[PDB]
Design a protein around this ligand. Structure first.
Ligand code: CL
Ligand code: CL
Ligand code: ZN
Ligand code: ZN
Lengths: 229, 229
């Protein structure tokens, strides 16, 4: 033989394999930015499935997160990243400025599903510094000229009720507390609490948190409520 | 001197520092599961701010993500994690079964804000295998007895329109495509496309993706639309 390993095959390079894998995608061929995010995923997928396959097979079977995160759409607040969690840990609603509007049937459905079917125990409303909806709300008159301004009406009204001297972060914090109150007052939570008091259901809790972009820290606003005082 | 460093101070242990930092939180003292997730955050924050402070200070200043992710609340689909992205990269809407309902004013507001103010170029609706809303929808009669079933009415109706032999993943995929169509038909996108055709606005694109929990891979369904064919 021509040396000790004259016929040994090398795997194809990962980049070549990924390129071929992304051939299915029309848009990846057209937009470098789309190819980039899909490549990101393929390297992640290759790593997790070669180093944690048990974990990936557990995730196929179902989900049992203990938390529901009601947070902002803002790109700087990805819940799993900033809590150093894993897939399977946190059920999530994200919308502009982390509102939980009582009249929003889709939000009410999500909360009911989270509590009654998914099995979450803790609901956290999480606001964050630098929140654009709150910054916008802070300077608006009481009412609406754009979809956004109409959407922000409850935060505008809250701003107009806050004391003289309140700053943007005061509004962001109060907006968290307002959403917590709306979650607490939901038929879902009111129902779950009455059943818990009856010993017919687990206790479920609602919390209000603030993510401080300047430090990376989550601060508890200490507005937690449960079935009992 | 008693040796070479007889008065050298050691920092307090990180766990002690974090415990003290979480003293502010009432609930962390009450629920081990809450203390756990807050600790997770504090270790993450300590690491990023000591190893990437430039990045944290950039994030304080604002956000300019190129993508809007319209995805499911399911805890197994955290967008930044599965695309190996960072904070600042992806603006997010998450709701049950990744619907974009035309009548939902909060969803319309989020989309308008994303396009007109945040500056996103690409909107991805991302469904996923194992989607509970779709699994539930798959066996329901046409209509609603729970908030969930009422909420899922459009997916139930879609299921009833699919051909004989369609499976759960076929419904999940078609549900993605349905949401893409609803995004495309929005006043926001229709308006943005007309302005782009006029050369008065950038081109914006809508895509449909599927996250396969069995492999960790994102597959492009190839339903992308833009201002031009
Ligand atoms: Cl109350
Ligand atoms: Cl069209
Ligand atoms: Zn925000
Ligand atoms: Zn789902």
């Amino acid at each position: 033989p021509l040396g000790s390993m004259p016929f040994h095959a090398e795997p194809l390079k990962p980049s070549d394999e990924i390129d071929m894998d992304l051939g299915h995608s029309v848009a990846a061929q057209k937009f470098k930015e789309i190819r980039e995010v899909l490549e990101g995923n393929r390297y992640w997928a290759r790593k997790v499935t070669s180093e944690e396959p048990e974990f990936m097979a557990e995730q196929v079977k179902g989900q049992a997160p203990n938390f529901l995160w009601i947070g902002c759409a803002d790109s700087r607040v990805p819940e799993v990243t900033i809590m150093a969690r894993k897939p399977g840990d946190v059920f999530v609603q994200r919308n502009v400025a982390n509102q939980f509007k009582p009249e929003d049937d889709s939000s009410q459905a999500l909360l009911n599903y989270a509590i009654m079917n998914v099995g979450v125990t803790h609901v956290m409303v999480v606001g964050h510094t630098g929140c654009g909806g709150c910054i916008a709300a802070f300077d608006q008159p009481l009412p609406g000229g754009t979809p956004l301004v109409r959407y922000l009406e409850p935060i505008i009204r809250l701003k107009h009720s806050l004391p003289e001297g309140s700053d943007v972060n005061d509004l962001i914090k109060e907006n968290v507390k307002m959403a917590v109150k709306n979650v607490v007052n939901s038929p879902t939570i009111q129902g779950a609490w009455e059943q818990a008091r009856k010993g017919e259901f687990r206790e479920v809790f609602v919390h209000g948190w603030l993510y401080d972009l300047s430090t990376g820290n989550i601060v508890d606003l200490n507005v937690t409520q449960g079935p009992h005082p």
